[PDB]
């Protein structure tokens, strides 16, 4: 079996969440951060036919780029990963499972406490203005009807008061307020439109972003206001 450039691109984006990854047989890939604060899942076209744990995914994808696109991938007799080309062959090592952190099961996202959607333009603008104005922490909030996402600077402001950026997405219908603060360190998604689900309970919370290829789940900080 092979790996299309979009599959390798999804894996390369996943590599920003974890340097390693766990692959089980099927057509479904996933990964978790070591601190469990972010998570990613994806339904992909190419088929996985043998379970393997990968220690360094970035170098693996680079070596895949070093050979042809029709590179056959299989499991060598010693247990490693064989990559067969026309005349060349690569033997990438297989990792021990105890040295890579993987989600033990696909996470069951509960009922969405709130929902919205984000166009790709808003996401790219948010990323650019964060890189610019040095935004390290964001927060979703409700104003006079619409749901907006604001961003301060947690280093220069431990109390979260100076709104250095804000962006408007859609309208909110309900009766409960929710100002969820989230750290930017758990924000590794490829650009595009995302259907945003948000769940909260008690001091805990999560935010799922459904995309065409992958879904990205992000945790909330400790002192996040719920009002649910």
Partner 1 sequence: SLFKDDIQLNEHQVAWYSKDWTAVQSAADSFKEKAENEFFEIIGAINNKTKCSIAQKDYSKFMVENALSQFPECMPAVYAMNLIGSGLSDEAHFNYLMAAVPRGKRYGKWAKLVEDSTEVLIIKLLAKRYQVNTNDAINYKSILTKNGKLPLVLKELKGLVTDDFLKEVTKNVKEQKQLKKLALEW
Partner 2 sequence: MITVNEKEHILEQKYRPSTIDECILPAFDKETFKSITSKGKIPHIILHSPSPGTGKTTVAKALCHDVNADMMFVNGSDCKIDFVRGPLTNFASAASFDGRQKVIVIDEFDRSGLAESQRHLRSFMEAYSSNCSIIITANNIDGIIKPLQSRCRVITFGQPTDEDKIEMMKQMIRRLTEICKHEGIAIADMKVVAALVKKNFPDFRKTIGELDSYSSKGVLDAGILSLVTNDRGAIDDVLESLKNKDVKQLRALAPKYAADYSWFVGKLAEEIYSRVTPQSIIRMYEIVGENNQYHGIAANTELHLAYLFIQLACEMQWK
Which residues of this chain interact with partner 1, rule CB under 8 A? 18-20, 32-39, 53, 55-56, 59, 78-80, 91, 93-96, 98-101, 103-104, 107, 204, 206, 217, 219
Query: Which run of H or E residues covers position 6?
Result: helix 5-14
Residue 88 binding a copy of itself, by CB under 8 A: yes
Q: Which of 34, 120, 133, 185 is in the footprint of a copy of itself by CB under 8 A?
A: 133
* Nearest in space to 18 (alpha carbons), one of 186, 172, 148: 186
- The two tokens of residue 38 are 């972010």
Nearest to 163 by CA among 200, 186, 133: 133
Query: Which of 25, 27, 43, 125 is in the footprint of a copy of itself by CB under 8 A?
Result: 125
Distance CA 77, CA 72 (A): 15
- 132: helix, coil or strand? helix
CA-CA distances (angstroms) from residue 136 to 12, 74, 127, 158, 164? 23, 42, 11, 12, 11
59 near a copy of itself, rule: CB under 8 A: yes
Sheet containing 194-200: which strands, arranged edge to edge?
Answer: 26-32, 38-48, 214-219, 205-210, 194-200, 114-118
Task: Between 131 and 162, name the residue whose CB sits nearer to DNA.
Answer: 131
- For the segment 67-96, give every residue that binds partner 2 (CB under 8 A): 78-79, 93-96
**C-beta of 63 vs 160, nearer to partner 1:** 63
88 binds DNA (CB under 7 A): no
Told to check if 65 binds DNA by CB under 7 A, we report yes
CB 15 within 8 A of CB 87: no
Partner from partner 1, DNA, partner 2, none contacting 158, C-beta within 5 to 8 A by type: partner 2
Sites of contact with partner 2 (CB under 8 A): 53, 55, 78-79, 93-100, 134, 155-156, 158
Sites of contact with a copy of itself (CB under 8 A): 59, 62-63, 66-67, 78, 87-92, 122, 125-126, 128-129, 132-133, 156, 162-169
């Amino acid at each position: 079996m092979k790996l299309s450039k979009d599959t390798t691109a999804l894996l390369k984006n996943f590599a920003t969440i974890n340097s390693g990854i766990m692959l089980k047989s099927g057509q479904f890939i996933m990964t978790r951060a070591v601190n469990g604060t972010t998570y990613a899942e994806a339904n992909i076209s190419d088929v996985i036919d043998f379970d393997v744990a990968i220690y360094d995914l970035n170098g693996f994808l680079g070596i895949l780029s070093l050979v042809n696109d029709d590179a056959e991938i299989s499991q060598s007799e010693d247990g490693n990963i064989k990559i067969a080309d026309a005349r060349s062959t690569i033997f990438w090592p297989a990792a021990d499972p105890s040295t890579v952190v993987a989600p033990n099961k696909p996470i069951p996202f509960p009922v969405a406490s709130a929902v919205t959607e984000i166009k790709a333009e808003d996401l790219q603008q948010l990323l650019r203005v964060s890189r610019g104005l040095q935004i390290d922490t964001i927060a979703i909030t409700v104003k006079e009807g619409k749901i907006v996402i604001n961003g301060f600077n947690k280093v220069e402001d431990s109390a979260l008061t100076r709104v250095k950026y804000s962006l408007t997405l859609g309208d909110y219908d309900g009766e409960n307020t929710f100002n969820f603060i989230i750290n930017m360190a758990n924000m590794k998604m490829q650009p595009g439109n995302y259907k945003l689900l948000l769940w909260a309970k008690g001091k805990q919370g999560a935010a799922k972003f459904e995309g065409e290829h992958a879904n990205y789940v992000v945790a909330l900080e400790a002192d996040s206001t719920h009002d649910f």
